[PDB]
Amino acid sequence: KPEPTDEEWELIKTVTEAHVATNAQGHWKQKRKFLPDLEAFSHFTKIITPAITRVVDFAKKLPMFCELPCEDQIILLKGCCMEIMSLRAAVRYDPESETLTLNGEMAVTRGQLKNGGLGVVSDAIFDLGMSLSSFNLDDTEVALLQAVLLMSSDRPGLACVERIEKYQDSFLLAFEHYINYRKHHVTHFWPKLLMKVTDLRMIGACHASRFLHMKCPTELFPPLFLEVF
């Protein structure tokens, strides 16, 4: 099966380095602090702003992202924050405590997130994290999933649709070719990862539909959180 080309290895170095530079902690498990309906919902929305900022930081370290006009950059980032933040929490599922880790510091339970306004989406993120255990995603695989979600040509209002689709096709080969090389001991690993991308895409849309729901004065919500929905 085809393995990464010389230029695909450079793209993997680049996107991996971007991810590791903008991922909270990375110890995240040992700096972890466990937590003991607009009052859990403050103390969450409050902790989003740094997580949104870390995503912006990932995108800005990707030279392909920086070649786009900022109208398209805003659009891309508005469509992939919750996806990336959801993946970043789901890869930090602890099977034993049954927690996800936010900002590499706060362990939350399924209940805490549903109580903090995520609603059904928290069930989706936990379920994903549970299923991502057997996948054993490394930092390169996570970074490439992130770049694939960022370079979504389907996002509304974009100008450079075909340029974005080309960037996304570069990541999808590099990622598949890396997958072929990592030789994961799961059957049809590529097809199943592609289904996970879709799980994340569904998380980004459901969250962005519960927003339109809570309109609960908008100024109780952090400024960045409102610009991304």
Partner: peptide
């Protein structure tokens, strides 16, 4: 309209 997100996008 998206003014903080724009401020962070530009350095």
């Amino acid at each position: 309209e998206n003014a903080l997100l724009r401020y962070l996008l530009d350095k």
